[PDB]
Scaffold this active site. Structure first.
Site, PDB file in Angstrom:
ATOM      1  N   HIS A  76      29.399  37.931  22.290  1.00 37.51           N
ATOM      2  CA  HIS A  76      29.285  36.485  22.076  1.00 37.51           C
ATOM      3  C   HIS A  76      28.029  35.965  22.783  1.00 37.51           C
ATOM      4  O   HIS A  76      27.224  35.229  22.195  1.00 37.51           O
ATOM      5  CB  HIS A  76      30.548  35.777  22.607  1.00 37.51           C
ATOM      6  CG  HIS A  76      30.523  34.276  22.490  1.00 37.51           C
ATOM      7  ND1 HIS A  76      31.334  33.583  21.614  1.00 37.51           N
ATOM      8  CD2 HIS A  76      29.809  33.337  23.160  1.00 37.51           C
ATOM      9  CE1 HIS A  76      31.116  32.286  21.744  1.00 37.51           C
ATOM     10  NE2 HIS A  76      30.191  32.108  22.674  1.00 37.51           N
ATOM     11  N   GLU A  77      27.854  36.355  24.043  1.00 34.71           N
ATOM     12  CA  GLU A  77      26.704  35.876  24.810  1.00 34.71           C
ATOM     13  C   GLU A  77      25.379  36.401  24.254  1.00 34.71           C
ATOM     14  O   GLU A  77      24.421  35.636  24.088  1.00 34.71           O
ATOM     15  CB  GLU A  77      26.839  36.222  26.301  1.00 34.71           C
ATOM     16  CG  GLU A  77      28.137  35.736  26.966  1.00 34.71           C
ATOM     17  CD  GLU A  77      28.463  34.274  26.692  1.00 34.71           C
ATOM     18  OE1 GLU A  77      27.533  33.468  26.493  1.00 34.71           O
ATOM     19  OE2 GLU A  77      29.665  33.934  26.675  1.00 34.71           O
TER      20      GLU A  77
ATOM     21  N   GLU B 295      40.825  37.637  17.900  1.00 29.94           N
ATOM     22  CA  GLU B 295      40.993  36.685  18.997  1.00 29.94           C
ATOM     23  C   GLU B 295      39.775  36.772  19.900  1.00 29.94           C
ATOM     24  O   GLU B 295      39.089  37.792  19.909  1.00 29.94           O
ATOM     25  CB  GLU B 295      42.242  37.022  19.816  1.00 29.94           C
ATOM     26  CG  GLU B 295      43.516  37.132  19.008  1.00 29.94           C
ATOM     27  CD  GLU B 295      43.979  35.795  18.516  1.00 29.94           C
ATOM     28  OE1 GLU B 295      44.360  34.959  19.364  1.00 29.94           O
ATOM     29  OE2 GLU B 295      43.949  35.574  17.287  1.00 29.94           O
TER      30      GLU B 295
HETATM   31  C1  LIG Z   1      36.392  28.376  29.504  1.00 29.37           C
HETATM   32  C2  LIG Z   1      35.049  28.428  28.802  1.00 29.37           C
HETATM   33  C3  LIG Z   1      35.191  28.171  27.303  1.00 29.37           C
HETATM   34  C4  LIG Z   1      36.026  29.256  26.628  1.00 29.37           C
HETATM   35  C5  LIG Z   1      33.845  27.959  26.586  1.00 29.37           C
HETATM   36  N1  LIG Z   1      32.987  29.128  26.757  1.00 29.37           N
HETATM   37  C6  LIG Z   1      32.845  30.051  25.806  1.00 29.37           C
HETATM   38  O1  LIG Z   1      33.433  30.008  24.731  1.00 29.37           O
HETATM   39  C7  LIG Z   1      31.911  31.192  26.128  1.00 29.37           C
HETATM   40  C8  LIG Z   1      32.612  32.233  26.981  1.00 29.37           C
HETATM   41  C9  LIG Z   1      33.817  32.881  26.313  1.00 29.37           C
HETATM   42  C10 LIG Z   1      33.401  33.707  25.101  1.00 29.37           C
HETATM   43  C11 LIG Z   1      34.598  33.712  27.333  1.00 29.37           C
HETATM   44  N2  LIG Z   1      30.752  30.769  26.891  1.00 29.37           N
HETATM   45  P1  LIG Z   1      29.388  30.048  26.117  1.00 29.37           P
HETATM   46  O2  LIG Z   1      28.218  30.985  26.045  1.00 29.37           O
HETATM   47  O3  LIG Z   1      29.857  29.530  24.791  1.00 29.37           O
HETATM   48  C12 LIG Z   1      29.032  28.687  27.240  1.00 29.37           C
HETATM   49  N3  LIG Z   1      27.897  27.928  26.771  1.00 29.37           N
HETATM   50  C13 LIG Z   1      27.106  27.219  27.554  1.00 29.37           C
HETATM   51  O4  LIG Z   1      27.251  27.174  28.769  1.00 29.37           O
HETATM   52  O5  LIG Z   1      26.006  26.505  26.951  1.00 29.37           O
HETATM   53  C14 LIG Z   1      25.351  25.483  27.696  1.00 29.37           C
HETATM   54  C15 LIG Z   1      23.975  25.951  28.095  1.00 29.37           C
HETATM   55  C16 LIG Z   1      23.819  26.735  29.234  1.00 29.37           C
HETATM   56  C17 LIG Z   1      22.552  27.173  29.602  1.00 29.37           C
HETATM   57  C18 LIG Z   1      21.445  26.836  28.828  1.00 29.37           C
HETATM   58  C19 LIG Z   1      21.608  26.060  27.686  1.00 29.37           C
HETATM   59  C20 LIG Z   1      22.875  25.616  27.320  1.00 29.37           C
HETATM   60  C21 LIG Z   1      33.160  26.714  27.085  1.00 29.37           C
HETATM   61  O6  LIG Z   1      32.098  26.806  27.751  1.00 29.37           O
HETATM   62  O7  LIG Z   1      33.678  25.617  26.795  1.00 29.37           O
HETATM   63 CA   LIG Z   2      38.841  39.916  20.794  1.00 32.03          CA
HETATM   64 ZN   LIG Z   3      29.186  30.391  23.129  1.00 31.30          ZN
END
Ligand SMILES: CC[C@H](C)[C@H](NC(=O)[C@H](CC(C)C)NP(=O)(O)CNC(=O)OCc1ccccc1)C(=O)O
Ligand SMILES: [Ca+2]
Ligand SMILES: [Zn+2]
Ligand SMILES: [Ca+2]
Ligand SMILES: [Ca+2]
Ligand SMILES: [Ca+2]
Length: 316
Positions: free
Chosen positions: A142-143, A187
């Site tokens: 994902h990341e 999931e």
């Molecule tokens: C509890 C965290 C949530 C599930 C959600 N995060 C997520 O769904 C996932 C991680 C899961 C795949 C484990 N992390 P993500 O990469 O989408 C977080 N995104 C994020 O921080 O973007 C903002 C940003 C950060 C740095 C630079 C530019 C923009 C969220 O941030 O809301």
């Molecule tokens: Ca999975």
């Molecule tokens: Zn994300």
């Protein structure tokens, strides 16, 4: 760093043993020279200064509890690199073998992971909501997929384009999880979310409503939280992707599934040839239809199924 390529061994977050590609020069570093211009894993040491220090180890054995998140970030970055190269002929996130960098042990009790514009970053979690997040192959992929998106379509991280950005990361996170073929599912984050609760996850692509996310455009969130609901409205696109791959009948609309591989080809082509920074859901539908047309022909089942899936989730 300059050194000779070596192979270390250790245990990941879930207690599984795996080999990892390292580099020897006085110490053994988490630097994998076998993939592109390298995969590099760093220790953030519970602080928020990035990237931190390139991970150094005296004996090339990584069995300490503190080592586990590094082992998995490093190894799953490798798997993700392999997926993009072997399946889509894409060399790293920029298509030119850019070095892939990850930092683990970011901050304290940090319940998230992210791409910061230049590198992947993983919290350890607080032990209750999450265990160290690099333990999830879908999370790592994902990341890294955020980096791929940023170098290609460039989907702006808000509102509909942002929800597409998120869905793309969930879709490829899941396809990488299937590629590795260890307990694969539709999931997100199940391997690292809530160690005290079995059977849950952060999001479901097969049934986004299970965790409160919309599975139809009529249920889209239009408020301002979460950058206009990027992790919420992703459910609408995740559901469409799930339907394209696996089929099903959703609000009375039946979709004939065409399988994961074709889902991946269609969405990879859409991401890299048709989507733009401002694409909305309707434009994604058009991009996916065109992508399927390029790959399989206008009269194909594949094209028909893409249309059915977007119809099913209310996107015209
Ligand atoms: C509890 C965290 C949530 C599930 C959600 N995060 C997520 O769904 C996932 C991680 C899961 C795949 C484990 N992390 P993500 O990469 O989408 C977080 N995104 C994020 O921080 O973007 C903002 C940003 C950060 C740095 C630079 C530019 C923009 C969220 O941030 O809301
Ligand atoms: Ca999975
Ligand atoms: Zn994300
Ligand atoms: Ca060691
Ligand atoms: Ca799984
Ligand atoms: Ca759980």
């Amino acid at each position: 760093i300059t050194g000779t390529s070596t192979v270390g061994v250790g245990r990941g977050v879930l207690g599984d043993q795996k080999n990892i590609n390292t580099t020897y020069s006085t110490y053994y570093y988490l630097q994998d020279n076998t993939r592109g211009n390298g995969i590099f894993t760093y220790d953030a040491k519970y602080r928020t200064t990035l990237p931190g220090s390139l991970w150094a180890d005296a004996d090339n054995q990584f069995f300490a509890s503190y080592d586990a998140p590094a082992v998995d970030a490093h190894y799953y970055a490798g798997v993700t690199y392999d997926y993009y190269k072997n399946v889509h002929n894409r060399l790293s996130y920029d298509g030119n073998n850019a070095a892939i960098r990850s930092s683990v042990h970011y901050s304290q009790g940090y319940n998230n992971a992210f791409w910061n514009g230049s590198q992947m970053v993983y919290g350890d979690g607080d032990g209750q909501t999450f265990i160290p997040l690099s333990g999830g192959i879908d999370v790592v992929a994902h990341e890294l997929t955020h980096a791929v998106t940023d170098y290609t379509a460039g989907l702006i991280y808000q509102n509909e384009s942002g929800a597409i950005n998120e869905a793309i990361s969930d879709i490829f996170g899941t396809l990488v999880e299937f590629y590795a073929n260890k307990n694969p599912d539709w999931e997100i984050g199940e391997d690292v979310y809530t160690p005290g609760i079995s059977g849950d996850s952060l999001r479901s692509m097969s049934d986004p409503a299970k965790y409160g996310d919309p599975d139809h455009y009529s249920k889209r969130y239009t408020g301002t939280q979460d950058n206009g609901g990027v992790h919420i409205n992703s459910g609408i696109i995740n559901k469409a992707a799930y339907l394209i791959s696996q089929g099903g009948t959703h609000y009375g609309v039946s979709v004939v599934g065409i399988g994961r591989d074709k889902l991946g080809k269609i969405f990879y082509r859409a991401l890299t040839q048709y989507l733009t920074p401002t694409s909305n859901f309707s434009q994604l539908r058009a991009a996916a239809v065109q992508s399927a047309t390029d790959l399989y022909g206008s009269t194909s089942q594949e094209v028909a199924s893409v249309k059915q899936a977007f119809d099913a989730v209310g996107v015209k």
